[PDB]
Amino acid sequence: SPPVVDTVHGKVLGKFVSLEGFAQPVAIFLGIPFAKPPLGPLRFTPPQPAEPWSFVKNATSYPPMCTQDPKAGQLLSELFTNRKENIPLKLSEDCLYLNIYTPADLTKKNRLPVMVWIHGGGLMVGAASTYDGLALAAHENVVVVTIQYRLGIWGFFSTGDEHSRGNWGHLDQVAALRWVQDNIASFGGNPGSVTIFGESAGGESVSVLVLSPLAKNLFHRAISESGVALTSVLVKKGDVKPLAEQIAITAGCKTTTSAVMVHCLRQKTEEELLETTLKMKFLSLDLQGDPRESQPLLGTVIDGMLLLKTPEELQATVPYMVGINKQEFGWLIPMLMSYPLEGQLDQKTAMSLLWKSYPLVCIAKELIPEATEKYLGGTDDTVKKKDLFLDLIADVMFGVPSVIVARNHRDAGAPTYMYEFQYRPSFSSDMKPKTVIGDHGDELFSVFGAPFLKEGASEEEIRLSKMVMKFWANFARNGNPNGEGLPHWPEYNQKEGYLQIGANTQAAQKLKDKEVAFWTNLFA
Amino acid sequence: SPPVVDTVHGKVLGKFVSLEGFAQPVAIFLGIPFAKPPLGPLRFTPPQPAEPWSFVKNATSYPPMCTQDPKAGQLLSELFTNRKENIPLKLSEDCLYLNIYTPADLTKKNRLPVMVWIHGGGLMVGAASTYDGLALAAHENVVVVTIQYRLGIWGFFSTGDEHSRGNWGHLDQVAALRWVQDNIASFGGNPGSVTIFGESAGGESVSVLVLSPLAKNLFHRAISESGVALTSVLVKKGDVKPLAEQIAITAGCKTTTSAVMVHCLRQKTEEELLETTLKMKFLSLDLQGDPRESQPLLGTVIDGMLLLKTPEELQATVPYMVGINKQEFGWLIPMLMSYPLEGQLDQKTAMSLLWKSYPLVCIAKELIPEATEKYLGGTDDTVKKKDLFLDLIADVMFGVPSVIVARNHRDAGAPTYMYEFQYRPSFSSDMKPKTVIGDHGDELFSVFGAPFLKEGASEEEIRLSKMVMKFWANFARNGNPNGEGLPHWPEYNQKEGYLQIGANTQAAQKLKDKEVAFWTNLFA
Amino acid sequence: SPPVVDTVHGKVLGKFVSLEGFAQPVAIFLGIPFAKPPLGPLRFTPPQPAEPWSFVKNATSYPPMCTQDPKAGQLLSELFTNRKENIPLKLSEDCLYLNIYTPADLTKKNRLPVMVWIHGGGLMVGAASTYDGLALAAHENVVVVTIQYRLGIWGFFSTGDEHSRGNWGHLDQVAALRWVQDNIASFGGNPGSVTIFGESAGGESVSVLVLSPLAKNLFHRAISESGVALTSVLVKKGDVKPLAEQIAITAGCKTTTSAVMVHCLRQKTEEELLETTLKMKFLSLDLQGDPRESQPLLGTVIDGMLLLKTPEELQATVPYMVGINKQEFGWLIPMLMSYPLEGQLDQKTAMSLLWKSYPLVCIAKELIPEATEKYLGGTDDTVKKKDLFLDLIADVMFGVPSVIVARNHRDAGAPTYMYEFQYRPSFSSDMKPKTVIGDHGDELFSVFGAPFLKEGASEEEIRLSKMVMKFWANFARNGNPNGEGLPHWPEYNQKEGYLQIGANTQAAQKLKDKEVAFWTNLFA
Numbered sequence A, B, C: 001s002p003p004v005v006d007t008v009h010g011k012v013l014g015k016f017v018s019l020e021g022f023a024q025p026v027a028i029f030l031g032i033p034f035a036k037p038p039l040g041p042l043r044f045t046p047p048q049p050a051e052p053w054s055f056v057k058n059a060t061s062y063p064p065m066c067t068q069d070p071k072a073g074q075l076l077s078e079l080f081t082n083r084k085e086n087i088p089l090k091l092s093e094d095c096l097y098l099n100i101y102t103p104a105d106l107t108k109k110n111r112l113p114v115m116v117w118i119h120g121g122g123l124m125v126g127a128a129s130t131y132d133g134l135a136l137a138a139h140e141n142v143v144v145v146t147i148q149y150r151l152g153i154w155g156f157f158s159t160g161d162e163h164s165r166g167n168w169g170h171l172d173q174v175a176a177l178r179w180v181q182d183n184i185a186s187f188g189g190n191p192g193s194v195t196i197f198g199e200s201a202g203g204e205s206v207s208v209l210v211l212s213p214l215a216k217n218l219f220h221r222a223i224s225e226s227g228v229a230l231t232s233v234l235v236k237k238g239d240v241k242p243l244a245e246q247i248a249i250t251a252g253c254k255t256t257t258s259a260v261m262v263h264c265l266r267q268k269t270e271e272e273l274l275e276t277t278l279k280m281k282f283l284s285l286d287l288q289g290d291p292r293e294s295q296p297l298l299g300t301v302i303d304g305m306l307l308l309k310t311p312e313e314l315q316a317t318v319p320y321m322v323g324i325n326k327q328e329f330g331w332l333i334p335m336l337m338s339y340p341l342e343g344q345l346d347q348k349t350a351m352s353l354l355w356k357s358y359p360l361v362c363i364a365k366e367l368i369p370e371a372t373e374k375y376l377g378g379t380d381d382t383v384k385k386k387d388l389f390l391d392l393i394a395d396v397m398f399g400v401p402s403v404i405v406a407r408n409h410r411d412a413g414a415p416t417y418m419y420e421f422q423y424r425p426s427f428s429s430d431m432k433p434k435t436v437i438g439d440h441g442d443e444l445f446s447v448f449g450a451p452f453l454k455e456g457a458s459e460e461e462i463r464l465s466k467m468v469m470k471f472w473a474n475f476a477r478n479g480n481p482n483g484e485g486l487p488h489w490p491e492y493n494q495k496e497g498y499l500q501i502g503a504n505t506q507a508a509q510k511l512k513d514k515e516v517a518f519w520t521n522l523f524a
Ligand SMILES: *[C@@H]1O[C@H](CO)[C@@H](O)[C@H](O)[C@H]1NC(C)=O
Pocket: A013, A058, A060, A061
């Protein structure tokens, strides 16, 4: 008979699922609410606690994903899911749910390390249910929790003042971690041992939670995969009013005051707000006009409740793993953003492209020829220059900020680890050219045990996933990924040792060292 | 000058009305609020206390009745009113009011027994103001309180979970009883002595209040006239989600989650919700398709706040009077539901009709020929078979559940009385054929003293009302209807004595005994 | 390969279907348009010709039925369909289509008699596709055409003046007959030989077409089954303004002038107009208030284009067959109208019921006791009195008007035939009691060959259908139903011979003779 667990708010019923090679089934619970649905007047306000229920709640069907572009959403889900078949999800504003995969013995009080996954998707798209926790939970004996949080307008609308501070989706992430603290023990999890992990906007979310006083003591280790808060495209600093005014005008609202914009947006239906989103054309490199106006998405702001100062100002202490992939801009991102690419580049085109990429990389027009010349100037081949140009964007968006974050964290005295992931999963899209290796998202298939759920993995890819899961879980359990029978992974100290993970797994030193000196010198 | 009374929330002004034969006038107060109007976000939530007022509130005009089909509402009001002329009422969502008839001396502190009336109308229609308390109050010296409660979608919409538990109209009934506890003393009533009474959906409401921990100690005696909670068409058990989804779809709302349905219904106007009600065609026997889909009304659910388990589960202690009429299905009900009836019935037609009557009687198709044969098999006359067929439905809906309720109540040690009312009031509709005697609703004219308010009563009908009022009020005052100069009414003990009331009033024994054995044996 | 026919407006493709016992298949064409869809500004205006099409139109799926109550519509369709399974239809304003069943040899120029069927349903509900023409077409070798026409508000909204004259659904019937004149030859039909036939509102439609100068020469014989125009509930005389004002108010329109009501109704969506229909509660005997206000449906008016004077005024010449069934009010009609019926009746209840039946029978209150006493006064049995009461309504609505129409038609010199149909089809509803014989609609199963399409007919019922089809078709072909091997059917001359059809088929004389003398004497 199926597993039934008592939680503070009432009982929940899930399901037992087996995995070849494990004699104990995993108990799976889908669509557990962790907050009141943020509808009606709750739109653009902090999450409220869920109301209790009097009878058993069924937690056996996937929850809706937060409102978002359903085509971009479905497409990102197919690209990143570790399951055999993608699970088609419904859209809704009622999306504050989490899913739990627990291999514990639910009769006997276990206290397994808890890993709370935060999905990516630029804070605009994405879903928890894309990520099946079964393989990680069963192989490594940890409770996997996948969470959702408000996206896009619903998640990040900000007037830059007290009428709509912003960061609703981050406060959701915080409320899901409070829920874990209060309830995970009934699922066989140790609330005394919670690791947050996430990729891309999810990695940026981990990073913001590492910086935020609201999240202090709701987790004990942190992992950012390909995304941190510092200097990110996902962080909006200075005056955010002009974006709020455009969103309100696009929705047909007056812009007379902040409170007027918020109240009027609060009267719109889900559909009207989705139509507004559609008209703003987020997540597309805008090729027309002055690149300084282009507005690629909504994001984190400095709201004064979750974040008090800019990441850079705070910079000036849990174990923290910060990693990046070898080709962060190799394919997936330029292809989701409609980057204009022949697959070759002369220097002048490269400059115009970089200038157009201003909202992604923020390089002043005066500095464009220098920057371009630095990355492209060593070679003749316009095919290579194209590669070197993709390298440049990757380093600015991901490689440099991640290494700057890791160094500041190390210097503040906390345990720090870094990796650079370099592997071509056999689960890549068929449209992805062979030469792309360690694209954005490539490490998800290892971390989530896709070789144990999907067909066709090579022997090497199977062993790669076992090793990455074991490092991840050893880090969840001990704040140090090392253990018997694994390559040594050095702590990121003054030597800046890091692990190269993938096709040939080995320790190395000084990740992005010369890049960080170059960009830092350039911007200051 | 008119009577003015102080209540917790402020002063109220009513009116003195005289009745031929009493030298003291009765003070009447119409349209006293007992809760905040349940509008806007208060829709589908528990009643809130009324806000206080600073100056005298006028309580001299009838309140609106709860939103409902205005034609079915007006028609039921004319059929059941004990007044000379029916009072045309306005519809509104703002309908949480009660009316008070007090014969007390408002200068001198009286403490009269209080009888709180709960109207019927299938939880879909009905109004307090239909029932004029003047004659009962004056003849028997009791404070009569008629209350309203939310009806239909407004009153009973349930998603089967915490987002819209349901039973809003019952919580209203509870809030009106709290109001009585706190305020009735200023009207000359004893809050230490409150009897609830009601007919049909009103009798079912009394019964639910008898079972509910929320109503404990808000009343001291109970009367159910023709309706109890156990096995009722008015009680919806198991999964109530499919009905909620139909109502939401009919209203043009998405059904993605419970909270989504509730929020969207909360945005509809009163008119849109009335149009939805109209499109669902409640209170009409659906003659097309599979009778197991037919959905005749909304109703009580097991919501976990008012009711914790099914009546049957609880079954497994105030004085309680449970009664039924001789022909519960003789006319009024089949005529309000458009029952298809020639006034004669062969056995095969009877079976098809019973199968179509599934939402009223819930008899499985395999058991239909047995059940039909049991009631119709002793006779040739298809006119009689038609009578016997009406008997069968009455016994299933009213006679058996009432006797099962009374027996369980007796066995739990509480004082229990039963009656079977058999009289043809001269206030029956002109369209009601002569041979119908003790139809559903026939006892209301006695209980409410219609011979003292309307013209044309026979001497016997006049004496019948005096006697019934006196039994009712003796029961309100003592928890035992007996007194000097009345026929003896035996307590319902192991002998199952009950009173036959009407054309020849006398004690008898074993009401519906062989029927209860038959149906119980049949269903188990 | 399937049959393809050229019509004035373009080619149409249908399908071959076989019937056991005929070696030639019948060609069936479903959903042929005969007018422009009456949408947008075409609402409440005369039908316009269909626009031509350039490529083959597929005529192999049932068309939508006109907008109407979908539950009452579906229920009437199941009750009256001659097919094995009822075909669920879509609702739409775009409903001006006809269906054709032709047994002709489409290569070889045939010219078969054409029978154009007009469905009933009180001018409020009904559909062409309910009636499968296959069996009649194949057995009798005629082209069967089933037509649709606008219903309810769409079909009959009238301001009583030139801004919305009314009778839109009748003008539709006329336009379908023009289409037949112009196109039927391509389907193997003789446009020189078109018989109109219809039942109930369909029989009333035939009758109106017999009276109308707009329909002169568009048909050559006529059959009315259970419904004529004279004195009908379906004919609205005098001032029709008050009904138009109620419909406009119910729809939320101002009533300042006729043109204002029409323009505002023309802005409403299909759904809003269906909601208005639902709120007026048509086709239900209204049991409350003064029966002279009750408004049971929309109908034919004297619009000045289709009808110039009242039927009675015109009364003061194609072969015409006028028939009625033995128990026109026995079951189906009182059961669709929620007639309040115990199945027995004392005289005073009978009077109140008759007075309530005013919109059906129009008997002044002063004349009620006389009328009632005339039909019920010969007997004691309240079961019989109930039968005799049903007889009275039937005679007033159907038997007397039909015989008055037939006599006037005879006296004007045209060939006239009458029948009274008395049979209990085995295809009756299971809820229909055994004793009802020749109910309203019972003859449709014979006329449409239901014993050849549905299971279970007795040998007698099979022979009854063959005989009725053959009389109907002999009448279509010759204007005289007689032929070799059939019972003799006398022409309705001064002797008033008519055919009793059913359980024992024989000539008789003087149908409803004493009834016509009684009611005529009563009303004048
Ligand atoms: C829970 O809901 C699922 C739908 O996903 C259903 O199949 C199942 O019967 C439900 N379980 C219980 C115990 O009601």
